[PDB]
Design a protein around this ligand. Structure first.
Ligand SMILES: *[C@@H]1O[C@H](CO)[C@@H](O)[C@H](O)[C@H]1NC(C)=O
Lengths: 48, 24
C-alpha cells in the first residue's frame, strides 16, 4: 500500500512511514538507500 | 615465461563498499 503511513518489515528492516514509486537509478546490486545522515531512505521491493 | 615490470595505478581500483544507493 502506497501513499499511506504503514509499518514496514522489508526483508527484516522494521520501521514505519509512507511508501511510493520512485524514479531512482538503483544499480542491479543496490538493495538499500540512505543519506549523508545514514538513515534508511529507499528499500527495493524483494518481490517486485 | 613472464616479465615483472612496474608501473603506476593512478586513480584506479575503487569499488562500491556496500549496496546502499547514495546520491549528491
Ligand atoms: C514471485 O513468485 C511468483 C510465483 O512463483 C512469480 O509469479 C513472481 O514473478 C515472483 N516474483 C519475483 C520478483 O521473482
Amino acid at each position: 500500500v502506497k501513499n499511506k503511513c504503514v509499518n514496514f518489515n522489508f526483508n527484516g528492516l522494521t520501521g514505519t512511514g509512507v511508501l511510493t514509486k520512485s524514479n531512482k537509478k538503483f544499480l542491479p546490486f543496490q538493495q538499500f538507500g540512505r543519506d549523508i545522515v545514514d538513515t534508511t531512505d529507499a528499500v527495493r521491493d524483494p518481490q517486485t | 615465461t613472464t616479465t615483472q615490470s612496474y608501473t603506476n595505478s593512478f586513480t584506479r581500483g575503487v569499488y562500491y563498499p556496500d549496496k546502499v544507493f547514495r546520491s549528491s
